[PDB]
Amino acid sequence: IYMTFGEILKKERVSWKLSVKELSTLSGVSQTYISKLENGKRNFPSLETIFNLLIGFKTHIEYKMGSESPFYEINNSYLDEILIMFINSSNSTISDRDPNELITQFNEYYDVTIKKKQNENSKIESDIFSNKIKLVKGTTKKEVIEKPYFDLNWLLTQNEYEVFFDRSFLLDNNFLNKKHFTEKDMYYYNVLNDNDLKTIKDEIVVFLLNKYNYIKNKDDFFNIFTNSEDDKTKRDALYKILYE
């Protein structure tokens, strides 16, 4: 006794603690259409929207469980066993149920999609590189922004605007014995001074550097990482910058 496509989708979406919005961001599909598919207010969907939803879970799973080798195989095998479960739905309109035709068709649809995405990135390589990007947490879904507000390094190093903390661990002026209260700094006592910012930047610069791996050339390492060159060819080239 099989469940309907809508029932199956809701089971998976919920079991991964994803909201309709969250999955609609991870996938091309609208909040409204997702919802309607799960109710049965929309019939069994197109094969292309099915592939889009799987691409949705694909992005998430890789965020959560990881792209690592031990999970890499588990993930590819999983997404396949779901793609079959969908086209074997009680209300399915797919009798070409030869899995290996669909599984291969999905991998050949995914690849086509990657290329489009990378072409669209290449156009805004400037703003991607300079971190002038608003990237929804968990997702590869992004929106270009006027400055790199979400770059922690930039926030600490920029001289354009005052940086604050919560209205808590404040009185960053230990000099609270100044007679008439600093003009309009009865509002902005949260402002970190230039000294503090550089001490915090150095703290983090150390912390990160005795883990991970410092990159000598930025322009270069990025430029080789983002292109239509073979995976196994460029991994060598990345290791060359990390170990000369």
Partner 1 sequence: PMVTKEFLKIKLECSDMYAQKLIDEAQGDENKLYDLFIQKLAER
- Which positions lie near partner 1, rule CB under 8 A? 11-12, 15-17, 61, 64-66, 68, 70-71, 74, 77-78, 81-82
Q: From the list partner 1, a second copy, none, which binds 156 (C-beta under 5 to 8 Å, kind-based)?
A: a second copy
CB of 112 to a second copy, least distance (A): 14
Burial class (CB in 10 A: 0-12, 13-18, 19+), 216: exposed
| Per-residue 3-state assignment (H helix, E strand, C coil) for 170-199 | CCCCCCCCCCCCCCCCCCCCCCCCHHHHHH
Q: How many CB atoms lie within 10 A of CB 53?
A: 24
Q: From the list a second copy, partner 1, none, which binds 16 (C-beta under 5 to 8 Å, kind-based)?
A: partner 1
- Please report, for residues 45, 77, 163, 220, the alpha-carbon distance to residue 58 in angstroms, rounded to integers and kept in the order given: 19, 11, 37, 29
CB of 101 to partner 1, least distance (A): 22
Residue number, 39 or 77, with CB nearest to partner 1: 77
99/91 Cα distance (integer angstroms): 17
Q: Which residue do the tokens 């029932």 mark?
A: 7
CB of 29 to a second copy, least distance (A): 18
Q: From the list partner 1, a second copy, none, which binds 17 (C-beta under 5 to 8 Å, kind-based)?
A: partner 1
CB of 170 to a second copy, least distance (A): 6
CB of 68 to partner 1, least distance (A): 7
43/6 Cα distance (integer angstroms): 9
Residue number, 4 or 148, with CB nearest to a second copy: 148
CB of 91 to partner 1, least distance (A): 20
Torsion over CA: 230, 72, 81, 31 (sign): negative
Q: From the list partner 1, a second copy, none, which binds 74 (C-beta under 5 to 8 Å, kind-based)?
A: partner 1
Residue 211, C-beta contacts closer than 8 angstroms, at least 6 positions apart: none
Q: From the list a second copy, partner 1, none, which binds 65 (C-beta under 5 to 8 Å, kind-based)?
A: partner 1
Residue number, 65 or 94, with CB nearest to a second copy: 65
Question: Helix 99-123 to helix 47-64 angle, to the nearest 10 degrees?
Answer: 70
Q: Are 22 and 46 in contact (CB under 8 A)?
A: no
Residue number, 94 or 197, with CB nearest to a second copy: 197
Q: From the list partner 1, a second copy, none, which binds 33 (C-beta under 5 to 8 Å, kind-based)?
A: none
Residue number, 75 or 89, with CB nearest to a second copy: 75
